[PDB]
Amino acid sequence: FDYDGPLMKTEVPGPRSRELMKQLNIIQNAEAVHFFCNYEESRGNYLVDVDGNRMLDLYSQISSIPIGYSHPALVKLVQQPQNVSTFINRPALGILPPENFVEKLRESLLSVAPKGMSQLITMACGSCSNENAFKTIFMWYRSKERGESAFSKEELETCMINQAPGCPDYSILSFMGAFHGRTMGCLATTHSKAIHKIDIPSFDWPIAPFPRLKYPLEEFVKENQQEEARCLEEVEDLIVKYRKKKKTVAGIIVEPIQSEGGDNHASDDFFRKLRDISRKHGCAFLVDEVQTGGGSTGKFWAHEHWGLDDPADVMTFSKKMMTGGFFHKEEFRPNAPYRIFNTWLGDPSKNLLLAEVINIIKREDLLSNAAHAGKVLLTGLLDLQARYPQFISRVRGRGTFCSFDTPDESIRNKLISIARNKGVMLGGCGDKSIRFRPTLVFRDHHAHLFLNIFSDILADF
Amino acid sequence: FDYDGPLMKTEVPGPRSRELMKQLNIIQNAEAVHFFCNYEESRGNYLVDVDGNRMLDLYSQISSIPIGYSHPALVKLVQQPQNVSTFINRPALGILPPENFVEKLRESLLSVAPKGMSQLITMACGSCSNENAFKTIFMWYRSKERGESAFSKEELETCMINQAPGCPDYSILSFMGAFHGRTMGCLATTHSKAIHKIDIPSFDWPIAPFPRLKYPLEEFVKENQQEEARCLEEVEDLIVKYRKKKKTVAGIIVEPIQSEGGDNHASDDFFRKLRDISRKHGCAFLVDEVQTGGGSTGKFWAHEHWGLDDPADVMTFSKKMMTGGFFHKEEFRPNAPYRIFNTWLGDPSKNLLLAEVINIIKREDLLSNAAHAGKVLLTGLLDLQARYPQFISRVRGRGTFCSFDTPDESIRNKLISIARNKGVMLGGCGDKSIRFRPTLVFRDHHAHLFLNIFSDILADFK
Numbered sequence A: 001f002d003y004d005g006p007l008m009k010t011e012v013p014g015p016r017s018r019e020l021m022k023q024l025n026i027i028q029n030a031e032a033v034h035f036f037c038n039y040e041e042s043r044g045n046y047l048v049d050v051d052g053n054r055m056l057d058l059y060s061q062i063s064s065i066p067i068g069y070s071h072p073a074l075v076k077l078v079q080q081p082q083n084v085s086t087f088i089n090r091p092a093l094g095i096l097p098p099e100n101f102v103e104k105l106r107e108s109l110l111s112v113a114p115k116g117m118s119q120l121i122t123m124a125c126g127s128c129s130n131e132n133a134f135k136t137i138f139m140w141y142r143s144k145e146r147g148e149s150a151f152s153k154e155e156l157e158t159c160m161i162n163q164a165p166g167c168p169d170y171s172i173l174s175f176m177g178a179f180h181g182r183t184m185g186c187l188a189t190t191h192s193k194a195i196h197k198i199d200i201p202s203f204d205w206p207i208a209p210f211p212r213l214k215y216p217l218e219e220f221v222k223e224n225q226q227e228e229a230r231c232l233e234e235v236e237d238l239i240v241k242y243r244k245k246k247k248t249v250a251g252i253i254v255e256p257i258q259s260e261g262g263d264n265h266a267s268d269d270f271f272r273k274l275r276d277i278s279r280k281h282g283c284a285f286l287v288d289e290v291q292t293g294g295g296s297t298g299k300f301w302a303h304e305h306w307g308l309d310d311p312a313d314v315m316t317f318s319k320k321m322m323t324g325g326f327f328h329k330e331e332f333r334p335n336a337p338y339r340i341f342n343t344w345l346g347d348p349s350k351n352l353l354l355a356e357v358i359n360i361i362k363r364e365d366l367l368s369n370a371a372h373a374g375k376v377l378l379t380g381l382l383d384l385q386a387r388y389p390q391f392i393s394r395v396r397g398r399g400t401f402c403s404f405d406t407p408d409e410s411i412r413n414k415l416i417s418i419a420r421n422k423g424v425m426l427g428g429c430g431d432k433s434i435r436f437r438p439t440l441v442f443r444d445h446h447a448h449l450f451l452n453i454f455s456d457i458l459a460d461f
Numbered sequence B: 001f002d003y004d005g006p007l008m009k010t011e012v013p014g015p016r017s018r019e020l021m022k023q024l025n026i027i028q029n030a031e032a033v034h035f036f037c038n039y040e041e042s043r044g045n046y047l048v049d050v051d052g053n054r055m056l057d058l059y060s061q062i063s064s065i066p067i068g069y070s071h072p073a074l075v076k077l078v079q080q081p082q083n084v085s086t087f088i089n090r091p092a093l094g095i096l097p098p099e100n101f102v103e104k105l106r107e108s109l110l111s112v113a114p115k116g117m118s119q120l121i122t123m124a125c126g127s128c129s130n131e132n133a134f135k136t137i138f139m140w141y142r143s144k145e146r147g148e149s150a151f152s153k154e155e156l157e158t159c160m161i162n163q164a165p166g167c168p169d170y171s172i173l174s175f176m177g178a179f180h181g182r183t184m185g186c187l188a189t190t191h192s193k194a195i196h197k198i199d200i201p202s203f204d205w206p207i208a209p210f211p212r213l214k215y216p217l218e219e220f221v222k223e224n225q226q227e228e229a230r231c232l233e234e235v236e237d238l239i240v241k242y243r244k245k246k247k248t249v250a251g252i253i254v255e256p257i258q259s260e261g262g263d264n265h266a267s268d269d270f271f272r273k274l275r276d277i278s279r280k281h282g283c284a285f286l287v288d289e290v291q292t293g294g295g296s297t298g299k300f301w302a303h304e305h306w307g308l309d310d311p312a313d314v315m316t317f318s319k320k321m322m323t324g325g326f327f328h329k330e331e332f333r334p335n336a337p338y339r340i341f342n343t344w345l346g347d348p349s350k351n352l353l354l355a356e357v358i359n360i361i362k363r364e365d366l367l368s369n370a371a372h373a374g375k376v377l378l379t380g381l382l383d384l385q386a387r388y389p390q391f392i393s394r395v396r397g398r399g400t401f402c403s404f405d406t407p408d409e410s411i412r413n414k415l416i417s418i419a420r421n422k423g424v425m426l427g428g429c430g431d432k433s434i435r436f437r438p439t440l441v442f443r444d445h446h447a448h449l450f451l452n453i454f455s456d457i458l459a460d461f462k
Ligand SMILES: *Cc1c(COP(=O)(O)O)cnc(C)c1O
Pocket: A125, A126, A127, A128, A130, A179, A180, A181, A182, A255, A259, A260, A288, A289, A290, A291, A292, A318, A319, B342, B343, B344
C-alpha cells in the first residue's frame, strides 16, 4: 500500500534521468522535464525515479493521481479477464456506447453529481471539458434569445463562413490569475503566466480581478471584505460594459481556488455573491473544478463548501477524475445532436478505473482524511512560518490544498530543488509560491515526514 | 481473428439498445446514438450489439479502430503483468515521463515519421493536436518576425489581457468542406455542416474553396484541372488579402481527402502546388491526417502519395493512431517550455497499444492489403454505379477510403438503414454521400461480402 519514508541515492535528476532527458530532447523540447520515472516500483505516496530515488510525492502529477501509485484495487481491475475489452476496444462514445456505459456512470460520476445538475457529458481532458462547456453556454444563450424561432436562413449561411449572425460575438468572463486550459478558447480565459499566453491569437472577452486576500485573515477582516466587494462590483461593471459593446457575456468561468496562477483563495461568501451576479445578468455560472475537484479540500467538489442548493449552472472536471466532462443543469441540455460531440468523448477504461477510485474514497473515508491530514500540514506550515519569516509568508489552505509564498522566484525554485534532493516533490505556482497537491492517500504521518525534512532545509538555507 | 459472416436477429437498434438509449437520454442528449454494443463479443471486422446482431463494420468507430475488434495481439498486452502500471499510473508526460517513454516512441510513432519532420509532440485527441499545431505555427511565425530577440515588455503585459501586440491577429487559412475538430480554434477551421458551427463565436480567418471534382474522372480531365487551378488562385489571393488586412496567414491547414464534409478528393498535383504556395508566402503547411492517417489509403500517411521530400511543416494525427499528436520540422520546435503543454499529452497506455498495432501493420503487410482490398471494393462500386446510375454516382476512393453519392439525403439515410439491418455498417458524410472506413483487417473477401449484400439491396430498392 505505501513505503515507510523517502530514500535518496543520488541528486535529482540523476545520471540515468539525465541520459533519458538528452535522448528526448532530440525529438522535442524537454526543458520542462523534472526526471524520468519507474512507475512500476512507485507505491502510494512515493514516486520512484530511474536512478532508484524514492520521493514522497506532494505534487501527484499536477494534482491528477487520486489514490496513489500502483493502487492494489486498480491492479485488480486490470488483472480481471472480463476487463480486457474495455482496454483494447475504444468506442466512439457519442454513437456506439458499450452495454455497461450507463451503469458504470451510475457507479462513478453520477454518484457524485453536484446539486441541481441532472445532466452529464464526458470529455477526455480538462481543456475539452471547458471548451465544450463554453459552447454549451453559447448555444443556451442564443436559444434564450431566439425563443422558439427556428435557426434563420441568415444564421445558417453565415455560420459556415465564420460570420455573424450565425457566429455570435458573445464572451465568457474570466479572472486575472485564472487557468482553464491552453486550447484557443480555454486560453482566452487563462491569465496565469505570460509564457502560457504570448504569441497566440485571443478573444476580446472581459477579465475581472480575483480577490487578493491579506494574511493572517483574522487581522484583515474589513480589508478582505472590502477587497472582495470591489471585485464583485468590477465583475458587474464588466458585464454591463460588454453588453453595451455588443459582446454580451454569456457565461462567467471561475476556479473555487485559483491553482496555476498562485493558489489564490476567496471566501465562500464571495462565491455565493458571484453566483448571484451571474444569475442576475442571465450569465451561466461555470465552475472549473478540474484541479479542485476530487476530494483534497475535504469535500468531493470544492464548491460544496459554499453550502448552496444551486451552486452553478455547469461544472467541469478532469485530473483526479481520470476522465473529464462536465455536469450541467437540465436547461443547458443541447437542443440537437452533433453540436457537442467528438470522436471519443472520454474513454470507458477511465470510467472503469474511476468507479473503483470513488469506491475507495467512500470506503476509506478519504474526504475526511484530507481535511485532517490537511489541518496537520497547515498547522506545521504555520509553525514554520513563525520560525522562518525571512522565507515563508501567506501560509494558506483548505484541506490538503495548501500553499505559501517565498521572497522571490529564485528562492522558490531553490527550495523546491533542495526538497526534491532531500526526498520530497513540491509544486510551484505563481511567481513565488510553493503549493501542495498530495494524493488522497496522504495521511497525517506523511505531513510530519515532510515537515521535519523541510524544517532542516530552512535551518540550513 | 474473425467470424465467418454477419448474423442478424433483430432490426437495429433492437429492444435492448432502445431501452439503454432511453436510460442514457435522461442524462444527456442521446439522439446521435446508433445502438449499444457488446465489444467483448466483437472480433475483427465484426461488431456485435446488445441484441445479439453481428454486423460487418465498415465505419470502424468513425475510422478509429486500426486492426479490428478484440485483436489477439492487443489482448496479450493487457494480459502481461509487466504492463499493469502503464494502465493505472497515468503520468503528467510533459514533466515526469516513464523510463520507456522514448523507446516506446521509437517502436511506434517515430518508426513512421513523415519525411523532413524530426520533431514529435503527443496529444490525446485530434482536436488538441490541431489546436497545438496552430499554436506551434503562430509562435514560429512570431519567431521569424522578431528574430533572436527577447519578448518585449509590452508583449508580456498585453498577452495577459488578451491584447495585441502580445496576442497577434494572425490567421490560419482553411477550406470549405473541412473538418478539423470542434474546440473553438479547430472549429474556426471547420466548415463541414451548419449544425457543427452555429451559435459559436469564431475567428475572421480566410476560407478557400476546395476543388469539387467531376466524375467519371476520365471524362473531365480538363475541367478538373481548371477547377483545381481556380482553387489555387483563390488560396493565393486570400493570403495576399489577409496580409493587407493585418491578419497575416501564418499557416494553411488541409486534409489529404476531406472526410466529414463529404469525401472530397483532389489530385496529387493540386497538393504539390498547394504546398508550394504555402512555402512561397511563408505560411506553414499543416496537413491534418487525423482521419486519412494510419494506412487505409495504401500508404501509412495519405500525403505520401504526393511523392514530396518536403511535404509539409506539421502533420497531425489521431483516431487509428490510438493517441494524437503532431510531427513537425525542427524549425517549428517551441523555443521555451510551457508554451505547448497540458497535463497528460496523450497516455502511455495508448502508446503501448500503438507499438503493437504498428508491429502488426508491418508484419502482416497491411498497407499493401488496404490497396488490394480497396481496389476490389472500388471496382465493385464502379460496377454497381454502372448498373444503378439512378442511385449511385461519383464513385471515388483511394485504398479502402471510398465513397459515392446518392440522389438525396433521405435515400442516403434509407440505404444506410437498410444496409445495417442486412448486416453491414456504413458511414454517411456530407448531405448525401456514403463512405467506407474499414479497419485494416478488411480483406478482399469482406469487400465481396459487402458488394454481394448491397447488390441485393439495390435490386430490391424501389
Ligand atoms: C489542469 C487544469 C485544466 C486543464 O486540464 P488539461 O487536462 O491540462 O487540459 C483546466 N482547468 C484547471 C483549473 C486546471 O488546473
